[PDB]
């Protein structure tokens, strides 16, 4: 048990009290300003004397020690809070860790001179970071936090209007309720629509995965491919059925030779003629091409 192992780990230290908070915070303050003046003399400020050096570094080290100390003391409260959020979405130890981080942040930004309990000011940062990471890493598809909040309000109001109406309310009722549009509600729900796994068996006799019944609608028709090939083949035949500059212009205008269709600009460029000469060209060409004589074979490829 890593859970209970860490539990025994954390029970190893006892709690503290007000003056504990008092002296530990004041110690850590002393250490931080000590290291501050330390880096002050880090740039050229002085040949720092021996006793001053020893006890300033000592103050630093001591504030650090008490720093870890209080955190340790409050880890029990960390667990006592985080216990009540599990059974949903995200694993427990990770919740523990992130509550630890939020503990870090709160104890960082904590004041004693406001003369409160440490835990009180802590709990804000605590549950904040907790629920934050909750919205963060509870979906394999990440979602904006405000999206999460609106979804939460949605589900709340949903159970509300359920027990009120006695039945599942209407989506129009709901959109009316949260003062947004029904399609907006729909989009919200869909975004609030969790994915499903492909590693369960649809059959009650379990031998086939659920993913063994998914038609790949973006797969290869294949015969269509050779169809496309022979398409090109009869194509080039018909291209050769007519004059040169015709087919050249056509391939250039359709990207048929390069994959990039050229405008009348490029075409009359390479030929040295006007656009509108090319337009005459194209007119006569599509006239010639638009013959049932020519399209009898060709119509089939549609």
């Amino acid at each position: 048990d890593s859970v209970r192992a860490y539990l025994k780990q954390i029970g190893k230290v006892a709690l503290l009290n007000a003056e504990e908070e008092v002296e530990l915070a004041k110690r850590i303050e002393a250490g931080l300003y000590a290291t501050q003046l330390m880096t002050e003399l880090s740039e050229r400020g002085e040949k720092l004397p021996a006793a001053q050096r020893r006890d300033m570094m000592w103050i630093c080290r001591d504030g650090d020690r008490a720093k870890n100390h209080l955190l340790e003391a409050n880890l029990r409260l960390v667990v006592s809070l985080a216990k009540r959020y599990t059974g949903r979405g995200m694993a427990f130890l990770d919740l523990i860790q992130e509550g630890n981080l939020g503990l870090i942040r709160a104890v960082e930004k904590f004041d004693y001179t406001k003369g409160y309990k440490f835990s009180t000011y802590a709990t804000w940062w605590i549950r904040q970071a907790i629920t934050r990471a909750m919205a963060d890493q509870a979906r394999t598809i990440r979602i904006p936090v405000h999206m999460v909040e609106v979804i939460n309000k949605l589900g709340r109001i949903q159970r509300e209007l359920l027990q009120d109406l006695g039945r599942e309310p209407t989506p129009e009722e709901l959109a009316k309720e949260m003062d947004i549009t029904p399609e907006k509600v729909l989009e919200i729900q869909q975004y609030a629509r969790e994915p499903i796994s492909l590693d369960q068996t649809i059959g009650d006799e379990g031998d086939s995965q659920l993913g063994d019944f998914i038609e790949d609608s973006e797969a290869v028709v294949a015969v269509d491919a050779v169809s496309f090939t022979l398409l090109q083949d009869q194509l080039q035949s018909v291209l050769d059925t007519l004059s040169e500059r015709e087919a050249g212009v056509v391939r250039l205008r359709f990207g048929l030779t390069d994959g990039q269709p050229r405008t009348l600009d490029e075409i009359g460029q390479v030929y040295g003629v006007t656009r509108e000469r090319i337009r005459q060209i194209e007119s006569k060409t599509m006239s010639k091409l638009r013959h049932p004589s020519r399209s009898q074979v060709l119509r089939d490829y549609l």
């Binding site: 931080l32 501050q36 103050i59 930004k109 998914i214």
Partner: protein, 108 residues
Amino acid sequence: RVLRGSRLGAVSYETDRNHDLAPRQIARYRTDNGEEFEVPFADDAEIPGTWLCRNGMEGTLIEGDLPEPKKVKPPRTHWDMLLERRSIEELEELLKERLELIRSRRRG
């Protein structure tokens, strides 16, 4: 019962023209651990010296340009979180406090 799917990408089908390709440039970027990664870029393509390479870390160009190294500071320090909320004079108070503290400790 039919259940179809589709990966979210397009699949065309041309012929593999090995002969005719867009010509293109080649660059050498250096990493922190002096790694050299090389990327064929288009001819008409700026070669930005910075690039996170196959290494996965960020890698700069082979050359020396140095437009702007960082232009960015650290986010915060717990020093700062205290400093905004506590005075330098408070700091010196607790400082000389602990000075006499350690004194009247071991050295009385």
